[PDB]
Amino acid sequence: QRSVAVWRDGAAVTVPAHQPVVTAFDLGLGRGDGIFESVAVVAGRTPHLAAHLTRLTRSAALLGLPAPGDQAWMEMVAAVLADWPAALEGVCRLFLTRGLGDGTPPTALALLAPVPADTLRQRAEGISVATLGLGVPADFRAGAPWLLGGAKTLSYAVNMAAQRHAHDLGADDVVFTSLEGRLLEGPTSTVVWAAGGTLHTPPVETGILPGTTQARLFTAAAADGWPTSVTPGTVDDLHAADAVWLLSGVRGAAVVHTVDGVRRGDGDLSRRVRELLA
Amino acid sequence: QRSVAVWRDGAAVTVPAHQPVVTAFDLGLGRGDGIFESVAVVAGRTPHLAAHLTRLTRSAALLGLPAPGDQAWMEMVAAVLADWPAALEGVCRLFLTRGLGDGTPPTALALLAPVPADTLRQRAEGISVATLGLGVPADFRAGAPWLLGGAKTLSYAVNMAAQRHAHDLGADDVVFTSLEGRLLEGPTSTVVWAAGGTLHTPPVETGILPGTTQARLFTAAAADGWPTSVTPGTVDDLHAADAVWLLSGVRGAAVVHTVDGVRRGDGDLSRRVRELLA
Numbered sequence: 001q002r003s004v005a006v007w008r009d010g011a012a013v014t015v016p017a018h019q020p021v022v023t024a025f026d027l028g029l030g031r032g033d034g035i036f037e038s039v040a041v042v043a044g045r046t047p048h049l050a051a052h053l054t055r056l057t058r059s060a061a062l063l064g065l066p067a068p069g070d071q072a073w074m075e076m077v078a079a080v081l082a083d084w085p086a087a088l089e090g091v092c093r094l095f096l097t098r099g100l101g102d103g104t105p106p107t108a109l110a111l112l113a114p115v116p117a118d119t120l121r122q123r124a125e126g127i128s129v130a131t132l133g134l135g136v137p138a139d140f141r142a143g144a145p146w147l148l149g150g151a152k153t154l155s156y157a158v159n160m161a162a163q164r165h166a167h168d169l170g171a172d173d174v175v176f177t178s179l180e181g182r183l184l185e186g187p188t189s190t191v192v193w194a195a196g197g198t199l200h201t202p203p204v205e206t207g208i209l210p211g212t213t214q215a216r217l218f219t220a221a222a223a224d225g226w227p228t229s230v231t232p233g234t235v236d237d238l239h240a241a242d243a244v245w246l247l248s249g250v251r252g253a254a255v256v257h258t259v260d261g262v263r264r265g266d267g268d269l270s271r272r273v274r275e276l277l278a
Numbered sequence: 279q280r281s282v283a284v285w286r287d288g289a290a291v292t293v294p295a296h297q298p299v300v301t302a303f304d305l306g307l308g309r310g311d312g313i314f315e316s317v318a319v320v321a322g323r324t325p326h327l328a329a330h331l332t333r334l335t336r337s338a339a340l341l342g343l344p345a346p347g348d349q350a351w352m353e354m355v356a357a358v359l360a361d362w363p364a365a366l367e368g369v370c371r372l373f374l375t376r377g378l379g380d381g382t383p384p385t386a387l388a389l390l391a392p393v394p395a396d397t398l399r400q401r402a403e404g405i406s407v408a409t410l411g412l413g414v415p416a417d418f419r420a421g422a423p424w425l426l427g428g429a430k431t432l433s434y435a436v437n438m439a440a441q442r443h444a445h446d447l448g449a450d451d452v453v454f455t456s457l458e459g460r461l462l463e464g465p466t467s468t469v470v471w472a473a474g475g476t477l478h479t480p481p482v483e484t485g486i487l488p489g490t491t492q493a494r495l496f497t498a499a500a501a502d503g504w505p506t507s508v509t510p511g512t513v514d515d516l517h518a519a520d521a522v523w524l525l526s527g528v529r530g531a532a533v534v535h536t537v538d539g540v541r542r543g544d545g546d547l548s549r550r551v552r553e554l555l556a
């Protein structure tokens with residue numbers, strides 16, 4: 001079902017999943033002032049844990065958050081995995097909040113639940129997306145560190161609101177665009193498209209999250225002799241592409257069959273992408 | 279010290295302030311997916327509670343959050359006020375989160391703590407501000423409801439990050455600006471300035487929060503024969519003004535004596551503003 005472990009006096013303490021763990025005054029709750037990582041649990045193991053802990057360190061640095069370090073997080077992951085069924089794919093989230101303030105200790109915990117059946121169905125059968133503007137110029141966040149570009153924060157209200165807006169239009173998910181129409185990323189995923197025999201993704205300098213699933217695909221692609229590129233694409237690139245995916249550590253590769261109500265095929269390229277991500 | 283009440287089976291239940299109240303899976307914590315209000319407690323009373331509950335309803339509507347209604351919130355405010363010292367000014371926050379998801383009940387609670395001594399000192403002695411761009415055009419959010427303009431959400435990571443960036447420059451607080459340099463609002467406050475015998479504030483259509491302290495000042499000003507205006511001002515207006523304040527329900531009227539390192543007087547206008555807010 002569900003498993004939680006909290007960082008308590010330099011140790012991981014298992015607590016029941018329904019038991020409250022955060023007080024009213026925690027800044028992760030009241031201000032969305034914290035960071036997180038979402039780690040896949042597959043056959044009772046965390047195949048990409050280290051990639052996620054490296055990015056956790058970077059997120060914590062951007063928010064000036066003291067981080068308990070890799071050892072602590074592996075102890076918390078171990079605690080929630082203890083009784084986890086290998087046959088049940090899980091999502092293990094790591095939360096690090098400012099706690100009661102800068103000066104008091106940050107709050108660390110791990111929470112593990114099943115990947116929902118609808119998320120597995122999106123991986124199997126793919127998705128529709130709506131393009132929604134963020135209204136920020138593509139070049140703006142590189143000059144505005146207070147906007148927390150490239151950090152994976154607890155402040156995802158907009159990310160969730162964009163998804164519900166999409167759902168209201170009849171789409172599964174979103175691709176965000178800059179003011180000038182440049183592709184950014186999904187609310188919870190990285191955009192990749194195939195065009196001219198090359199795998200493409202938008203540049204990180206635009207203030208998006210550097211996706212671990214997209215990075216591992218590109219590394220694997222390179223080795224398999226599939227050319228890759230960082231490309232400042234637009235919605236035009238998505239319509240024109242041979243294939244479009246949203247990639248994330250939990251959902252995986254979700255082929256985008258529909259962009260703003262415009263149906264699209266994948267050129268039977270999804271299979272090699274899935275093989276490379278395996 | 280601190281007081282908390284949680285909405286439990288249609289009643290306000292007092293819990294100790296140090297006691298955890300939110301589980302790991304609460305979307306207010308993991309996604310910053312909720313709304314809040316901050317209510318002043320002055321001589322053991324909530325002088326502007328109704329103004330805050332009206333805006334709570336509007337915030338909840340924008341996020342598609344079922345809200346427990348005014349009666350419930352007054353019961354929760356009553357529960358935390360019960361043993362509160364009248365001599366100690368407080369901040370009573372009301373949190374409404376999506377809870378475990380849309381379909382399961384939203385999480386409601388009230389949390390009361392003292393207004394910190396440094397916040398009272400800012401009210402007494404005023405503040406320095408840094409202007410920081412949001413990089414969104416002034417007209418953009420009115421067309422992009424997924425950006426949650428005009429909603430007061432738990433997703434304030436950027437709001438807090440801007441303040442720490444200001445603190446690093448040697449400023450107390452921030453005024454956000456649009457892409458074209460239009461004044462928006464503070465991370466936690468409303469900008470007002472005095473110019474040509476008129477009290478000015480930026481337009482709400484820019485996607486800012488409609489401030490209850492600024493609204494009550496303007497109503498009072500009107501009655502006292504101080505002209506008021508909604509004005510699409512820029513940073514130039516702040517430098518040029520006779521006086522600049524940041525207004526909020528907790529800090530109150532904080533005279534801004536410094537804008538981007540440029541010291542400024544208030545034309546001895548603060549006293550009439552404070553009298554009108556009394």
Ligand SMILES: Cc1ncc(COP(=O)(O)O)c(CN)c1O
Pocket residue numbers: 038152185186187188189190209210211212213214247248249250
């Ligand atoms: C905003 C955002 N962008 C991209 C991603 C994809 O990253 P990953 O492939 O590491 O899961 C995520 C999920 N962490 C995300 O939340």
Ligand SMILES: Cc1ncc(COP(=O)(O)O)c(CN)c1O
Pocket residue numbers: 316430463464465466467468487488489490491492525526527528
């Ligand atoms: C973003 C923002 N803007 C403005 C304000 C000022 O509103 P109020 O005067 O109602 O406290 C607040 C404080 N609620 C705020 O958080």
Ligand code: NA
Pocket residue numbers: 119188248250251
């Ligand atoms: Na997903």
Ligand code: NA
Pocket residue numbers: 252253274277
């Ligand atoms: Na796959």
Ligand code: NA
Pocket residue numbers: 397466526528529
């Ligand atoms: Na304040």
Ligand code: NA
Pocket residue numbers: 530531552555
């Ligand atoms: Na005053």
